[PDB]
Every structure is written in structure tokens, then in C-alpha cells.
Amino acid sequence: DWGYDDKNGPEQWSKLYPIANGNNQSPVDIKTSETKHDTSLKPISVSYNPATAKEIINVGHSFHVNFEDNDNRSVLKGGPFSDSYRLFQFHFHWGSTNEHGSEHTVDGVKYSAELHVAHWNSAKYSSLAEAASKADGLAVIGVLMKVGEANPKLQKVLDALQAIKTKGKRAPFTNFDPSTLLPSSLDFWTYPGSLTHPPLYESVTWIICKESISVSSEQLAQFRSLLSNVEGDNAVPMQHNNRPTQPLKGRTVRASF
Template identity: 25%
Template sequence: KIRFAFFFFFFFLFFYLFIAGPSFWGLINPQWNMCNKGRRQSPIDVVPDKLLFDPFLRPLHIDKHKVSGTLHNTGQSLVFRVDKDTKQHVNISGGPLAYKYQFEEIYIHYGTENTRGSEHYIQGYSFPGEIQIYGFNKELYHNMSEAQHKSQGIVGLSLMVQIGETPNPELRIITSTFNKVLFKGQQVITLE
């Protein structure tokens, strides 16, 4: 069993790195052609020394309304989706955004170890976790499905998670339900 698992691991690693990994996504599926050009590809490694400072960049604004929704284990990550009948929606605006985006989903990525779990990297460093916040352009589209494949349709924000001593009460609202979604397909309703 150990030899089989070892062989399978290296076969998967070889397959991912040299046949079907991120470098080949644009070749495997025509719908992913932007990946073949090295643009709009995920995961990414943010290298701070290569970033340009924009002195005119406005502060990013996220409304501070309480929302309820459902936390779902997809088997790859945990996804929080805002209830469709939410009374007050949370909007994301400012920064580099020319439009208002309505918050709809949070993807939570984490690993089996406390050192690696983020999907993206900063200067080659993987964080223990990553929270990705997604919203759709509410000025041009009616919902996520309509906006998904359109220009300026979706905005995504990534927050890298470090493990520390100081608790985060807002994050605790969602993380306190993690024990109810341990397995793929499980979901739990989270209240404001």
C-alpha cells in the first residue's frame, strides 16, 4: 500500500508539473486561453519589488452590514454564500474599482499544516490560509452567473491569514462553524 501511494503521489506530481498544471491550462482547455498568455492566471506569486505605487489609488471600501448565509464544504475549500434574500447587501468599491460590486461569496483556503494553505503566494511564501472575497458588478449585471464571464463582471480580493494569539471576533463567526462542515457536501447556515 505504501509503495502504491508513493508511486501515485509521484505520478500525480509529474502529471501536474509537466502535463496538466497551471503552465498548461491554456493549452488543455480553449476556454482558459488567457492562462496560455500568462495573464489572469491563478495561483499567482505577488512579488512586492515588482509592484508599482499608484499615488492616486483611492482607499478600498467595503460596507459594514451584517449578512447571513450558508457555509458549504466543496471538498476543495469552504465556501460562504450570502443568502439571496439578504435585506442589506455589502458593496465593495474604491481602490482600483470603477464600479460597485455586490459581495456574494467567500472562499476559505487552508492546509493540513499551519504553514501552508493559501492558494496564492507573496514572494514565494505560502500562508497558513487565505480568504478570498468575491462580488459581482451590480451596476452592469444582475447576479454572479450573469457577470461571471463578462468584462468587469467579478471582483476578487484575497486576504492572507496568519496564525496568531489575538482572536478576530468577525472571523470567529464563520470559523466557529467549521466543525459542522468537516466533510465534502456538508453545509451549515450561519447567522449575522
């Protein structure tokens, strides 16, 4: 079973997932002196229906908030896309201390956490399963989370975690629009990349927001107090789940700004 421990963690993933050492791996360090302003990039447009929010789940290495993805009620458009992308999930990554925890870095700076809002190409493909095997199948919005003031927009999410404390627990999570978590500016970087954990498929168009959102030290502690163990076992806190940055291998990061 893959994880983030020394034995099952990012450094070992290449043994069952050799794409780990591929040419389009994520995350990356965004060097602002090497980005290329692209005039053809349209603004990002999100239109999410809060009725598509379904369920929150403890998946052992992280937690996921899933959405109903049977129709186009909740869609991403614009940016580098011709196609509409259908929201299916959001989740976070964090680190063992405030010093690190983001997956993407900007000019070598590490943030405390990172929000991923994940979508699949419903213009071209008819399921997440089909879309995840395609170079153009997935679109993920990444938002860097900078330790500081408590973020009240996180409140429904953090309040839900006490019902999913241990691995495999799940609960209804309804009437939530995750566009409320995005920063006020949607200026972005984009590059072609991958899932940041197994199976590490090179199927993702990344959209990284230049503006951070806030999170308090105590809000991060709530993520780290989730348990990776099943109920009844010895408590094993979910201390971290961020992958180190990977080589660009000649990819261009483009800037909308």
C-alpha cells in the same frame, strides 16, 4: 471531477480548462521591487450588512459562506473601481502544513492560509452567472493569514464547521459581517487575474491586503479536519486547496501605498 489530488489537481486542470495556461491566471507572486505605485487608486470601502449572511456549505474541496446577493445591502467600492461590487461569498484556502497554504505569495514568502471575499459587478450586470463571464465581472479581496496567535474573529466560522463535516452538508449561517475578518489597514496591491480553481475564468480584479491577519496552528487544523467524502464513506480530510503561483506574463501589479 477536478480537485487538488495528484490525478485531478492543479497540474492537470489544463486538460479540461486550457485557460489554466492563459495570460491572466491567479494567484501570483507579488515582487515588491516590480510593483508600480498608482496615485489614482482610492481607498477600499466595504459596507456589509450582517443580515445578508445566508448559508455555510461543504463543497468537497473547501467550504463556502454565501450571502444573499439580490440587492446592494453589502457592497465593495473604491480602490481601482468606478462600479459598486456586491458581496456574494467568502472562503479560505490552506495547505497540508503551516509552511504553505496561501495562494498569493509576497517576495516568494508563503503564508499558512488565505481569505477570499468575493463580489460581482452589480453596476453593469444583473447576476453572478452573467458577471463571471466578464473581464470586469468579479472583485476578490485576498488576505494573507500568518500562523501565530488564535484569531477570535474566526470563531463563529470555525464553530459552524461541526454541522457541515462531509461533502454537500449545508447549514444556515446568519448575522455575520465579514469585514470583521479584514486587517485594520486596507493598503493593497491590485492586478487583473482569474478564479484560482476551475473554471479559472479571467474575470477577477484582485485586491491583496498588504497587512496579514493571524490564525493559530489549531485553527488551521480545524480547516484540515473538514472531510471531502460524503457521509458514510471512508473519511478523507481536506488537507489542502491552494493553487501554485502563475506567471505574470507582463501584467503590472499596482500598489495603493
